[PDB]
Amino acid sequence: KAAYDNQTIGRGETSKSMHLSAGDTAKNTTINSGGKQYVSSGGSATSTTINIGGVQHVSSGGSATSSTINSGGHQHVSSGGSATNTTVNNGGRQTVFSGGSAMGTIINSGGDQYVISGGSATSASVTSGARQFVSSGGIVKATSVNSGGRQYVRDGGSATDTVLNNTGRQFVSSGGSAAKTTINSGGGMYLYGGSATGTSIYNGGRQYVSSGGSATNTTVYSGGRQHVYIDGNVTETTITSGGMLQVEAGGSASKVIQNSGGAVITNTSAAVSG
Ligand SMILES: *[C@H]1O[C@H]([C@H](O)CO)[C@@H](O)[C@H](O)[C@@H]1O
Numbered sequence: 541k542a543a544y545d546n547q548t549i550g551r552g553e554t555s556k557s558m559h560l561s562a563g564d565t566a567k568n569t570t571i572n573s574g575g576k577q578y579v580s581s582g583g584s585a586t587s588t589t590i591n592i593g594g595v596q597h598v599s600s601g602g603s604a605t606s607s608t609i610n611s612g613g614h615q616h617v618s619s620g621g622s623a624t625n626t627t628v629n630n631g632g633r634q635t636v637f638s639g640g641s642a643m644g645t646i647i648n649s650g651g652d653q654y655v656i657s658g659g660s661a662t663s664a665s666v667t668s669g670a671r672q673f674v675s676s677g678g679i680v681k682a683t684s685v686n687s688g689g690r691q692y693v694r695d696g697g698s699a700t701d702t703v704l705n706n707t708g709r710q711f712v713s714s715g716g717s718a719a720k721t722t723i724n725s726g727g728g729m730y731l732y733g734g735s736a737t738g739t740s741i742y743n744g745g746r747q748y749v750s751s752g753g754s755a756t757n758t759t760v761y762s763g764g765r766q767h768v769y770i771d772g773n774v775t776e777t778t779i780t781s782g783g784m785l786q787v788e789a790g791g792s793a794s795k796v797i798q799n800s801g802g803a804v805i806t807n808t809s810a811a812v813s814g
Pocket residue numbers: 559560561562580
């Protein structure tokens with residue numbers, strides 16, 4: 541029955557709460573301070589603008605397409621909820637809780653996406669000054685960490701099929717895990733105690749394995765470098781002609797496949813195992 545348009549809600553607006561149920565619709569809503577939009581099962585919000593002290597709740601079976609989050613606003617994608625092509629600007633936060641799903645999120649300068657407690661995000665775009673945080677059962681797939689962008693894979697966080705482009709950075713902490721990371725030219729992946737598997741490092745890209753960190757099954761293509769620091773470990777690295785594995789004193793590598801023209805640099809004698 542219900543279906544709203546160009547409604548502004550919150551503070552000293554006409555209405556404070558907006559609720560959506562099965563079949564309801566909301567378009568170009570503007571959520572301002574004290575404003576709450578609740579998108580419930582079978583509800584659909586579209587083009588919602590979320591400003592300081594405004595919140596959009598996406599509950600189970602709810603859907604929110606093209607929400608745009610600004611300075612001090614919040615999108616909560618709860619269990620069973622779905623958010624598509626969300627845009628997060630300076631000071632905006634999208635949080636994906638247990639059972640929630642975000643697809644195609646664009647995170648802009650100073651914007652934050654938190655994927656926690658078993659939420660999932662696919663195809664996040666992490667641009668310059670943007671940040672993505674993944675933790676405690678949260679899983680992110682096909683994140684593009686673009687120039688200026690940063691992804692934090694924290695304890696219990698998991699990232700798959702991440703792509704790192706020019707000055708894009710991925711930080712994998714203790715208890716964090718990354719799989720099938722692609723490091724393009726200018727990309728940096730840092731294992732600050734965390735684990736990586738199935739990394740590919742193309743020309744200009746770098747993986748840095750620090751204390752407690754561990755890389756498995758890494759391919760270093762021409763111009764790529766895996767850099768292993770003290771008490772970092774790597775295994776099953778293949779170094780292609782023109783690529784490099786550099787191991788600092790006290791770092792370790794094993795099951796190294798060194799192709800002809802692949803550089804290996806060691807600073808201790810028992811550093812690398814072929
Ligand atoms: C919208 O859906 C229901 C409403 O009566 C119309 O279908 C409620 O159950 C919900 O709480 C929400 O208000």
